[PDB]
Amino acid sequence: CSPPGETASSEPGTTPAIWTGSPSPAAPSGEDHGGGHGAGAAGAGETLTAELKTADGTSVATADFQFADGFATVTIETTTPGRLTPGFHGVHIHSVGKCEANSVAPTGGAPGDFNSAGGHFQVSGHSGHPASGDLSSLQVRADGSGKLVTTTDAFTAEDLLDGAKTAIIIHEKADNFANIPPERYQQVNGAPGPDQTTMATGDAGSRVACGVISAG
Amino acid sequence: CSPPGETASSEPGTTPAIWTGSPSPAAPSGEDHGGGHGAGAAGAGETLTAELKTADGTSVATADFQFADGFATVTIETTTPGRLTPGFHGVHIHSVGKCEANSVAPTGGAPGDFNSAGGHFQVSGHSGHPASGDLSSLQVRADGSGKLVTTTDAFTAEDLLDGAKTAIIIHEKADNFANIPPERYQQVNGAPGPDQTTMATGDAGSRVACGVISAG
Amino acid sequence: LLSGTGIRAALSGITMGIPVIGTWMHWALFGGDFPGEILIPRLYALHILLIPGIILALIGAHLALVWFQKHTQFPGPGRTETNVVGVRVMPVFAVKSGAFFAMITGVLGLMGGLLTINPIWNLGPYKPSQVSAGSQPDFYMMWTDGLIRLWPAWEFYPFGHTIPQGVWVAVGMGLVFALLIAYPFIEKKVTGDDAHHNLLQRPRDVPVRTAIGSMAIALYLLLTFACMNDIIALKFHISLNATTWIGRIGMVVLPAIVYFVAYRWAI
Amino acid sequence: LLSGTGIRAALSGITMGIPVIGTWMHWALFGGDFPGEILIPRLYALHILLIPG
Amino acid sequence: GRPGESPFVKMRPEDIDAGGMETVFPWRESDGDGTTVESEHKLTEIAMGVRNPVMLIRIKPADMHRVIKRKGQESFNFGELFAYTKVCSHLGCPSSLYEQQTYRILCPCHQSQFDALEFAKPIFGPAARALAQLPITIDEDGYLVANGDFVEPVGPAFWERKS
Amino acid sequence: GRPGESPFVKMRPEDIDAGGMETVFPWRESDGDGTTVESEHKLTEIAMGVRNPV
Amino acid sequence: QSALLRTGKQLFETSCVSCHGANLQGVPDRGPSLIGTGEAAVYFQVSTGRMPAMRGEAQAPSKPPHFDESQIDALGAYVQANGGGPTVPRDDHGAVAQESLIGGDVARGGDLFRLNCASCHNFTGKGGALSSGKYAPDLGDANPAQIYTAMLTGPQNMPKFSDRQLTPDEKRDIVAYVRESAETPSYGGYGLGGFGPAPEGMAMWIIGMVAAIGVAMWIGSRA
Numbered sequence A, B: 001c002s003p004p005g006e007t008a009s010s011e012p013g014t015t016p017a018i019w020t021g022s023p024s025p026a027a028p029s030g031e032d033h034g035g036g037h038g039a040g041a042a043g044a045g046e047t048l049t050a051e052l053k054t055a056d057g058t059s060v061a062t063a064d065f066q067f068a069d070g071f072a073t074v075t076i077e078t079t080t081p082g083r084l085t086p087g088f089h090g091v092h093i094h095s096v097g098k099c100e101a102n103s104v105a106p107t108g109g110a111p112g113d114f115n116s117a118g119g120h121f122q123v124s125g126h127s128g129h130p131a132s133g134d135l136s137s138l139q140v141r142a143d144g145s146g147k148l149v150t151t152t153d154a155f156t157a158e159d160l161l162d163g164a165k166t167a168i169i170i171h172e173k174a175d176n177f178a179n180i181p182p183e184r185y186q187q188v189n190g191a192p193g194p195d196q197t198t199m200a201t202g203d204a205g206s207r208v209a210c211g212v213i214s215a216g
Numbered sequence C: 001l002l003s004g005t006g007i008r009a010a011l012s013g014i015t016m017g018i019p020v021i022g023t024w025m026h027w028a029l030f031g032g033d034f035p036g037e038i039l040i041p042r043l044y045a046l047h048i049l050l051i052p053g054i055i056l057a058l059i060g061a062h063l064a065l066v067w068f069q070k071h072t073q074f075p076g077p078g079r080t081e082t083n084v085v086g087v088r089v090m091p092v093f094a095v096k097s098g099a100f101f102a103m104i105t106g107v108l109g110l111m112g113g114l115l116t117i118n119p120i121w122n123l124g125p126y127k128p129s130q131v132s133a134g135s136q137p138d139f140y141m142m143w144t145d146g147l148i149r150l151w152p153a154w155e156f157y158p159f160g161h162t163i164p165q166g167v168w169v170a171v172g173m174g175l176v177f178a179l180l181i182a183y184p185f186i187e188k189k190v191t192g193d194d195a196h197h198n199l200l201q202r203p204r205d206v207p208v209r210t211a212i213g214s215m216a217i218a219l220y221l222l223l224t225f226a227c228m229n230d231i232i233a234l235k236f237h238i239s240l241n242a243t244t245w246i247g248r249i250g251m252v253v254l255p256a257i258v259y260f261v262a263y264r265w266a267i
Numbered sequence D: 001l002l003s004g005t006g007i008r009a010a011l012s013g014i015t016m017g018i019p020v021i022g023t024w025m026h027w028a029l030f031g032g033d034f035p036g037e038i039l040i041p042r043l044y045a046l047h048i049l050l051i052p053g
Numbered sequence E: 001g002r003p004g005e006s007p008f009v010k011m012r013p014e015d016i017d018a019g020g021m022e023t024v025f026p027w028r029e030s031d032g033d034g035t036t037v038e039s040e041h042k043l044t045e046i047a048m049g050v051r052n053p054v055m056l057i058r059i060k061p062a063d064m065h066r067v068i069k070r071k072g073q074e075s076f077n078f079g080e081l082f083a084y085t086k087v088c089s090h091l092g093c094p095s096s097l098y099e100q101q102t103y104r105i106l107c108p109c110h111q112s113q114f115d116a117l118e119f120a121k122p123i124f125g126p127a128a129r130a131l132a133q134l135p136i137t138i139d140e141d142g143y144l145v146a147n148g149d150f151v152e153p154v155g156p157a158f159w160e161r162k163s
Numbered sequence F: 001g002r003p004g005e006s007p008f009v010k011m012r013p014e015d016i017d018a019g020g021m022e023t024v025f026p027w028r029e030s031d032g033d034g035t036t037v038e039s040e041h042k043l044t045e046i047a048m049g050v051r052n053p054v
Numbered sequence G: 001q002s003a004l005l006r007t008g009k010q011l012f013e014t015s016c017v018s019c020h021g022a023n024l025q026g027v028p029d030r031g032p033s034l035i036g037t038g039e040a041a042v043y044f045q046v047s048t049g050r051m052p053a054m055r056g057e058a059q060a061p062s063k064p065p066h067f068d069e070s071q072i073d074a075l076g077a078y079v080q081a082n083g084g085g086p087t088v089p090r091d092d093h094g095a096v097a098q099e100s101l102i103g104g105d106v107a108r109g110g111d112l113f114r115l116n117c118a119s120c121h122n123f124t125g126k127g128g129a130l131s132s133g134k135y136a137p138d139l140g141d142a143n144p145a146q147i148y149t150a151m152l153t154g155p156q157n158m159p160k161f162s163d164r165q166l167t168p169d170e171k172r173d174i175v176a177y178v179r180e181s182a183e184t185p186s187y188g189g190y191g192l193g194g195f196g197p198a199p200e201g202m203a204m205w206i207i208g209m210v211a212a213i214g215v216a217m218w219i220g221s222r223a
Ligand SMILES: CC(C)=CCC/C(C)=C/CC/C(C)=C/CC/C(C)=C/CC/C(C)=C/CC/C(C)=C/CC/C(C)=C/CC/C(C)=C/CC/C(C)=C/CC1=C(C)C(=O)c2ccccc2C1=O
Pocket: C222, C225, C226, C228, C229, C231, C232, C235, C236, C238, C242, C243, C244, C246, C247, C248, C250, G192, G193, G198, G199, G200, G202, G203
């Protein structure tokens, strides 16, 4: 006797399709956690990275911020070694999450990587001092890299996923905020006070980079 | 018969001293190590913390930075809930590692938490733009906490452990860096250029906090 | 847990206690210290193959001797030292022997069903730390355990050496066995009966031996209940020290009283 | 390895090939599939006591 | 008695309260929880160590003045905590039973009573040698650690002992 | 055949070259490497799987 | 509560002042101090009925409760107010929690029992004998709350297992194991108590030996 199955010369066959397994069901529901935190928003977990893209599409930096124990942990690894000149880039948090080459929310001059709908991405009820939207200098030496953090928790993971996606913007200036005292310093008009342009958010030359903060 | 050895000998005894164990030669052949990194210096590893103290010793914050993959990863936790006023604080890297109440390296007025030997703790050969001495700004909302990061890698763990211990100085200002362009704004002297005092490092009001970076 | 602590006490402790080679015997039996990983397989080999085989060979010898040293008999009307009065094997004796085997098997099956023996599941796996209050062996080793309990903690300490109290029980067993195995020879040496005896003797007709056997049974029962002095105290409210000392005084007094009473009873 | 593959061939395959009760005999002998956790102790019982007896 | 994971956890003096006994084992830092395969075998060795188990008993302060110590073991107790081997000095059964308000360490294999107040010497039953007392103290972070090994062998006695 | 740890490793088509044979087993994501006590038995079960090897 | 404390004081002043001073400090060589014993101690000691002890002997035995649940709570609250100590567990309603004290895990509860409880009680919760006139009573009768409070307060010659030795989770686990062993039928026929070798041997020598010898006497003759 011969087994019933036997040969099939016809229908040569097709290349197997790439396998895409289904998620483990309620039985093996146990799986790696994506992160825990307060998450006072639609949901972001304890892991949220970002990629900083330059005007030519070449990555300049890679920002990241995620809630850990109610206080955000962040770190912006350099994307290229020669991306940053030996100097300070004005860091800021923009309310607009579109890092387009040239786009301005209002009717006026559209600076490069200036899609922010204003200055710094402050809190909803904050419109004065430099809230968490404002950031200080990101320093690069002759090596040309950026890796250093601070403490600025005017916001949280709850405010990270706002109505308009936020982003991390790298300017071309340090962090001073009208360091010239009003007693002896003066502005163009002679007023001892500082300029609102430099007070609302870190203003500098052409934007160094812009990276969407929505899990970029 | 009775066993040879028993009885107190009428000797009271003493309370056992706190146990202080030694390293494990039998189990470990050598001395185990923690964090790993390039550490081109006397040795810092991949773990270095810091504590931010106030003028009266109150814990303003707690910074911590360490080298991981050639780009220093840092983060500063909030030490108090209402420590930070609802505004912007300028975080900078100071050459002086002493968080004294008021120390002045040069000959002049000593400012609070101004023991830094100059402006920003740049590299040895870096004395111009805002090098690694500049760090992310400390923006504080009504919450009063610090959690935010930037990309400042002009200095590394190898350069961190320099001759003079470095530190983190928290100011009380935003990050502008003479954002007023020379075209429209002017200085007290009438020259469109900015002030060197605000260009050497982030200058603001009385220092908000000072924390030793030497594994504080 | 119960059997494990029984092993720990008996095998480990007593074997280690033996002066000259005790530790060596312990290390040979366990292949090392007590929790040696070759104990249970060795006991399995000894228990399913070796000891049952030796017992079967000795039972074969026993039954062969009884068969050919034709069974002894009690004195009676037509019964003498030179005959066997009874029933031939085939018609009657075989049938009743088989029926008795059937009924004994039935009793054992009824017990195996209706009575719970060694409910090991209640007894967790053996651990050197876990314990139980009962901690007895089967009744045939309860005399050993009771001899342990009642022997008053007597140890001796030679030049840099220890002779633990456990040693005593080993000697005890020796004597016990040394007296059980050898008894007929002591009987024939003392009494002087060197004659071919085929007619049994009613126990009453031998007051001295009946008294001796009653004394031995009394000592065995005292030791067995001493092993259960823990449970006896728990159920029958008697202080544990009181039961221990009752056994201690009894293992010397109760045998004497039982001997006297049994002697007078036989007479 | 050698004796294990010998068991696999003979005791498992032949036993489970028998038409009427092959699988049943295999599962009774091994208490389950071929590498069943009761095989070697049972063979030990068969080989030190039962078959020698 | 957790099923496999972290069966042993460091201990603190506050945990034992006056007139309380707890069985403790020699857990090393290397012998971490049983999560991995390398561990869960060291921990099994600790659990199956015949002489490993010890009982830590907190002597009531009111009874403290009654404690009688053993020469060479005068400081083995850390305050009112006393570590005595559970293994009976007679035939090596655990001496698990503990009676407070009478301070009697009882061994149930052969009903042997040691006085816990006085150095754990046998005051009744077959046992004739005192239970070995383990030196104890507290290390950094306040965890109870043995202050050294038993000054004498701890199991049941044997021929080559007491020299 | 590493001693105990990570006995089963993912495999990729280029690993086996033309005219090469490899014995492979049904390893799952859940059946991680053999470090854990929970693992080292799923992997042992895979190894002892009489019909598992391919 | 004010009325609860009043009732507890009333009951205390006429049931136990003789053993324990009116200020709850133990009378010398009659009874110990109740300061700091706690409501858990009072509940376990009086619910089991031990406390109207009525004699000083080796071991105070369990006996029918001399007070009802409300009076037990009154006495316990009185003692808790005086010294302050362990408190009997309670559920949402406020009654002495008994069902809620059955821990889910039993194997872990079994290990805990064997390491701690079986030392003197039994493999399966039966009793055990102690040094001189003392014993460990059977755990079959004690309700979950009583077992929990017994662990939480070592009555007499019982090690006191504080909340730190056995956290409420471990105590509930041990309670669950105790109840399961106590109420679980003995698989394999009538379980002769819980002690194996002694009842088993006694039952052999009675049932099996009397049956076998009687059958031998029936089959055999006498002469
Ligand atoms: C070393 C040693 C023997 C020390 C002394 C310990 C001991 C045996 C003390 C005596 C125990 C007794 C008899 C207590 C009752 C109070 C008492 C002493 C009264 C005075 C004694 C006396 C001479 C009275 C005159 C009349 C007389 C002889 C009365 C005896 C009364 C009794 C108990 C008769 C029956 C004998 C008997 C069965 C004793 C118990 C023996 C054992 C080991 C039982 C084991 C056993 C137990 C422990 C169970 O829990 C169990 C639970 C469920 C099913 C089965 C059993 C079971 O078989």
